[PDB]
Amino acid sequence: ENELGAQPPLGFFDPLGLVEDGNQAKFDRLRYVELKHGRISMLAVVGYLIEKAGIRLPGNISYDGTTFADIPDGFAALSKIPDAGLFQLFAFIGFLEVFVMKDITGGEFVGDFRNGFIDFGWDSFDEETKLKKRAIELNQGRAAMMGILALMVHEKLIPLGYDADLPIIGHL
Amino acid sequence: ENELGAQPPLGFFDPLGLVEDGNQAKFDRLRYVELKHGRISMLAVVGYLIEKAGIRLPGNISYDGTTFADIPDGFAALSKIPDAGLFQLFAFIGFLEVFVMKDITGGEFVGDFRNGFIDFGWDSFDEETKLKKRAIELNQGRAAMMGILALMVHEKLIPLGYDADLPIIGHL
Amino acid sequence: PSADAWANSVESKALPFARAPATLDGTMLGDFGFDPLGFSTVPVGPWFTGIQGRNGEIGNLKWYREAELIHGRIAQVAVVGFIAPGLFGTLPGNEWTGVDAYSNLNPLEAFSQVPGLAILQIFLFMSYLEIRRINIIKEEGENYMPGDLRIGQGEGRWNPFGLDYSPEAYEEKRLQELKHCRLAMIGVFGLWAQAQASGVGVTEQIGAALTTPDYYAKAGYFLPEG
Amino acid sequence: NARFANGKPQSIEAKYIMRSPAEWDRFMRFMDRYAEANGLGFSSXXXXXXX
Amino acid sequence: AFEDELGAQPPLGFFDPLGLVXXXXXXXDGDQEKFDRLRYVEIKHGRISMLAVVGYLVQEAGVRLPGTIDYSGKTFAEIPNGFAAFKEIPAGGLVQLLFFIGVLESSVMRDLTXXXXXXXXXXXXXXXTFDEETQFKKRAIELNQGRAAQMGILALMVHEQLGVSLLPXXXXXXXXXX
Amino acid sequence: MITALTALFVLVSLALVVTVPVALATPGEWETSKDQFNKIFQLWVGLVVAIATADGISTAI
Amino acid sequence: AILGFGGIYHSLLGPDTLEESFPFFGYDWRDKNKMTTILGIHLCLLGLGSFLLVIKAMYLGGVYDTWAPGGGDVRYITTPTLNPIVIFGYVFRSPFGGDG
Numbered sequence: 001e002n003e004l005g006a007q008p009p010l011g012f013f014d015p016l017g018l019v020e021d022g023n024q025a026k027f028d029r030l031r032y033v034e035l036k037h038g039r040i041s042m043l044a045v046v047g048y049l050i051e052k053a054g055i056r057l058p059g060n061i062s063y064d065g066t067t068f069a070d071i072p073d074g075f076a077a078l079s080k081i082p083d084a085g086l087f088q089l090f091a092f093i094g095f096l097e098v099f100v101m102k103d104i105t106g107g108e109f110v111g112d113f114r115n116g117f118i119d120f121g122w123d124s125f126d127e128e129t130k131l132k133k134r135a136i137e138l139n140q141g142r143a144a145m146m147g148i149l150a151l152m153v154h155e156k157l158i159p160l161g162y163d164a165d166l167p168i169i170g171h172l
Numbered sequence: 173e174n175e176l177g178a179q180p181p182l183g184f185f186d187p188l189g190l191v192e193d194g195n196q197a198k199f200d201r202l203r204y205v206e207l208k209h210g211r212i213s214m215l216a217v218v219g220y221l222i223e224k225a226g227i228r229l230p231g232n233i234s235y236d237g238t239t240f241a242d243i244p245d246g247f248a249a250l251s252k253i254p255d256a257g258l259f260q261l262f263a264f265i266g267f268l269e270v271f272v273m274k275d276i277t278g279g280e281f282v283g284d285f286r287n288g289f290i291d292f293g294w295d296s297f298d299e300e301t302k303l304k305k306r307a308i309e310l311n312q313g314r315a316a317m318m319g320i321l322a323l324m325v326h327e328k329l330i331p332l333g334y335d336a337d338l339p340i341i342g343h344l
Numbered sequence: 345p346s347a348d349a350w351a352n353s354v355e356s357k358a359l360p361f362a363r364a365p366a367t368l369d370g371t372m373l374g375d376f377g378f379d380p381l382g383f384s385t386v387p388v389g390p391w392f393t394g395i396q397g398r399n400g401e402i403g404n405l406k407w408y409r410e411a412e413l414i415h416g417r418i419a420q421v422a423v424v425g426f427i428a429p430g431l432f433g434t435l436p437g438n439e440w441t442g443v444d445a446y447s448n449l450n451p452l453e454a455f456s457q458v459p460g461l462a463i464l465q466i467f468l469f470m471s472y473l474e475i476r477r478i479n480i481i482k483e484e485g486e487n488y489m490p491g492d493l494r495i496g497q498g499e500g501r502w503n504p505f506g507l508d509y510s511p512e513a514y515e516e517k518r519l520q521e522l523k524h525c526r527l528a529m530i531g532v533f534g535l536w537a538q539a540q541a542s543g544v545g546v547t548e549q550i551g552a553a554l555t556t557p558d559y560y561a562k563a564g565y566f567l568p569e570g
Numbered sequence: 571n572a573r574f575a576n577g578k579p580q581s582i583e584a585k586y587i588m589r590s591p592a593e594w595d596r597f598m599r600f601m602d603r604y605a606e607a608n609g610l611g612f613s614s615x616x617x618x619x620x621x
Numbered sequence: 622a623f624e625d626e627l628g629a630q631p632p633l634g635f636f637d638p639l640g641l642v643x644x645x646x647x648x649x650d651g652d653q654e655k656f657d658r659l660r661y662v663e664i665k666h667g668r669i670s671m672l673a674v675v676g677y678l679v680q681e682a683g684v685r686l687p688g689t690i691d692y693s694g695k696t697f698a699e700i701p702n703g704f705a706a707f708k709e710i711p712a713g714g715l716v717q718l719l720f721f722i723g724v725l726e727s728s729v730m731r732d733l734t735x736x737x738x739x740x741x742x743x744x745x746x747x748x749x750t751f752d753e754e755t756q757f758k759k760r761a762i763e764l765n766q767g768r769a770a771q772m773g774i775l776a777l778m779v780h781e782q783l784g785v786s787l788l789p790x791x792x793x794x795x796x797x798x799x
Numbered sequence: 800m801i802t803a804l805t806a807l808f809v810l811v812s813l814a815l816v817v818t819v820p821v822a823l824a825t826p827g828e829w830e831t832s833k834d835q836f837n838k839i840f841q842l843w844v845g846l847v848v849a850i851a852t853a854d855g856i857s858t859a860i
Numbered sequence: 861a862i863l864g865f866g867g868i869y870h871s872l873l874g875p876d877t878l879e880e881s882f883p884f885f886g887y888d889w890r891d892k893n894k895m896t897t898i899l900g901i902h903l904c905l906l907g908l909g910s911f912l913l914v915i916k917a918m919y920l921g922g923v924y925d926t927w928a929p930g931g932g933d934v935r936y937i938t939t940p941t942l943n944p945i946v947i948f949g950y951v952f953r954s955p956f957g958g959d960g
């Protein structure tokens with residue numbers, strides 16, 4: 001429901017007035033939007049940090065003769081995957097998204113029944129598995145959502161981030 | 173809370189009588205003074221052993237051509253960090269100390285609300301959660317606080333603790 | 345919907361096209377109604393005084409005012425710290441090893457050159473005037489005045505001088521302090537950006553744009569008196 | 571000089587201590603009537619008839 | 622009128638030999654057989670076809686933005702005038718086209734709505750709107766303009782993959798004598 | 800096609816230069832005939848737009 | 861014709877005095893505040909008009925130069941001179957011979 005999310009040092013923080021309805025129904029949907037951009041941007045920054053560390057796989061990615069080292073770091077990488085690879089992301093992720101295993105039905109308290117193993121679950125600590133850990137993942141997303149808007153704009157004006165760090169880090 | 177840190181062999185041990193007076197406050201003060209000294213000393217000897225065993229990171233720490241391998245073990249290390257590194261320690265560790273993550277008020281019965289997941293167990297084990305684990309962490313600090321007085325005053329004579337284990341181990 | 349305070353909207357004297365979200369309210373001296381996005385509707389309590397105190401109030405600012413006061417006061421000392429090493433002497437360095445680490449006029453690079461024992465002793469003093477502020481936040485409690493290192497004229501705060509200033513002139517000074525606090529923060533951002541955009545200090549920029557640069561300046565006066 | 575392209579044309583510091591002191595010393599006489607007296611807008615067609 | 626009974630106009634008028642608006646004949650009760658969907662889904666294919674046909678004329682006429690489309694070495698002239706023009710583009714370019722299409726699609730211009738958006742055809746944000754009598758005509762004009770482009774762009778799809786580009790289809794034999 | 804569109808554009812603007820200030824300086828015939836001049840003003844700019852496309856297309860043909 | 865129409869508008873069909881129903885556009889000629897506000901509006905538009913040339917020379921298509929190197933040509937003014945002693949040394953120069 002409500003009573004989750006932001007927290008010290010903000011608490012309920014809707015300062016421009018986008019949700020001040022007094023209606024849970026609009027606030028419900030924008031929460032699960034934030035969970036989803038939470039979950040995606042988190043695996044994209046750690047995807048970015050592991051791609052930028054030079055952590056690659058060995059071998060060719062196809063019979064194009066593109067190694068995993070050939071695919072450049074940064075924004076170009078997803079763009080110059082071969083097209084038939086990008087269909088197979090779509091075929092698998094799209095099944096994984098809209099109906100199987102993750103079902104995002106309608107934005108519904110996506111609970112997905114993947115609750116850790118022992119850890120961090122009901123009939124144990126009250127404070128933790130919800131009202132804290134459910135709050136951190138969202139705020140983890142809040143860090144990583146801002147991490148990509150950075151990262152894209154860091155890549156937009158300069159080359160890639162490892163080529164942003166050997167030369168200048170100061171502003172334009 | 174009061175009965176803590178006074179398990180055998182020494183029991184309650186105020187030899188000189190500085191908690192001979194009364195109040196919760198100067199026992200509150202000196203406890204979390206003792207705990208934070210505990211927490212800092214414990215990572216500093218584990219920080220010592222992982223430095224002195226030759227576990228480093230390849231690559232320069234700055235533009236200088238100062239690698240992590242070029243930074244020697246011991247007390248030349250923290251001093252020969254470049255200054256802008258130390259001012260970024262004081263920024264982050266600073267924000268982490270006072271402000272982000274780790275609240276420091278007067279020693280507030282420092283709870284910090286995190287710890288693990290199924291682990292903190294009140295409602296499960298009233299003598300495991302506190303009074304044993306909360307007692308050992310104090311004492312592991314009490315070892316490690318006596319480890320860094322050790323760590324300095326050993327290294328004050330020429331071989332350090334990788335160097336002190338190739339030559340002489342005997343006293344002056 | 346706790347930030348619904350954009351429902352009633354007091355005039356933003358700052359922005360005559362926009363509005364102010366009614367928590368500004370004209371109580372505090374610095375208020376002229378500037379809140380183009382928010383942070384006024386929500387306050388935050390002092391988290392460093394309590395995990396209990398991490399949560400905040402609904403109308404009491406007190407802390408955005410301090411962060412406006414502390415950043416503004418440091419910035420006022422900072423703008424002199426950029427400008428005054430260029431106008432005056434630059435402290436001959438012969439006490440410890442290392443000669444003329446001070447002599448650099450660029451304040452970003454003179455930061456790195458000057459020995460780590462020197463800025464540490466600045467950091468220790470700039471520490472010591474602030475654990476003092478921790479105690480003054482604890483002792484004053486919820487009676488807290490957002491400035492107040494116990495320096496002022498009343499109470500026996502410290503009061504060295506002939507600080508005889510009347511409560512009307514006292515309201516002027518807090519306003520004059522605050523207006524320079526808001527002005528110096530943009531100044532330090534100016535000085536920090538000009539020291540990056542050119543590797544020189546201020547007196548090597550403003551004292552360079554008043555020169556008739558050598559390739560434009562005329563040769564001289566070679567006319568004879570006969 | 572003579573097309574040295576000077577600012578308010580001038581080739582010595584000695585005439586800078588002629589421009590400023592002769593403006594100022596016939597300025598301080600003007601101040602001696604109009605010092606310590608401000609404000610008092612009038613909103614008329616060129617009255618400004620205060621003394 | 623909002624969207625109902627629009628676009629039925631002579632010499633034909635109303636069209637159901639099939640049964641798909643008769644609501645009981647064919648493909649019925651399977652899935653998403655709401656007529657107001659199909660009412661809309663005609664219009665958007667019409668709108669995309671109208672920009673497809675008109676935009677294709679401006680492409681084939683040689684009207685080109687001057688410069689380079691990327692900094693990996695494609696100028697605007699190097700994109701062919703024809704069907705493989707969406708091929709010869711950087712793929713990261715085609716990411717960006719589809720993305721801003723999707724931004725319109727998730728938020729800005731309708732793509733949840735079963736009717737049309739707010740735009741109200743004139744120029745700009747002023748949006749000179751039609752009032753009563755003329756509007757019943759011109760909303761159904763947009764439908765008939767939509768359908769003619771839907772037949773027109775696919776006609777074209779059949780043309781040059783089986784033939785040659787519109788510049789050689791207008792520089793060689795085309796159907797009649799002329 | 801450009802020459803015919805600007806020929807109509809001059810002949811509309813003759814009626815505009817004449818009949819508008821005769822209807823502006825009339826105290827009665829503005830509020831009544833404003834929807835007759837709105838139709839022609841909107842038509843007039845909508846002819847400027849349709850003649851700017853014509854030069855725009857038929858230069859870079 | 862846009863500017864011609866609105867000039868014929870406010871000279872024939874308009875409020876004869878603006879300060880009845882438009883206080884933002886009305887004035888007294890003696891309101892020293894309001895007459896400076898109309899200055900300060902118009903100074904900004906002359907200011908934005910002057911950068912509009914600076915956008916034209918630096919960025920949008922450049923500006924013709926006869927001192928252009930190797931022949932007179934349209935070129936981009938990449939590095940103008942913003943030293944005020946150079947710039948205001950034109951204004952405080954003499955108006956006579958060769959100063960100019």
Ligand code: KC2
Pocket residue numbers: 061062063064081082083084085086088089090092093
């Ligand atoms: C969503 C993650 C994902 C899943 C679940 C998945 C499943 C399977 C299965 C099912 C069990 C088979 C049998 C299979 C086989 C091939 N995959 Mg693989 N695959 C995944 C992802 C990608 C990407 C991202 C690429 C890729 C490719 C190839 C090529 C060689 C093609 C060639 O050389 O022509 C072959 C043969 C690359 C490519 O398509 O190159 C054009 C390329 O980018 N795949 N793949």
Ligand code: KC2
Pocket residue numbers: 169233234235236253254255256257258260261264265
């Ligand atoms: C407390 C752990 C810690 C955190 C959380 C943290 C976060 C960030 C963040 C963004 C949030 C950025 C953007 C950032 C950037 C840089 N850090 Mg880093 N940083 C960490 C600490 C240290 C230390 C000890 C050093 C250091 C350095 C650099 C240099 C290179 C400067 C150069 O070589 O020019 C750059 C650019 C070294 C250094 O300052 O060299 C003079 C150096 O010793 N950092 N750092």
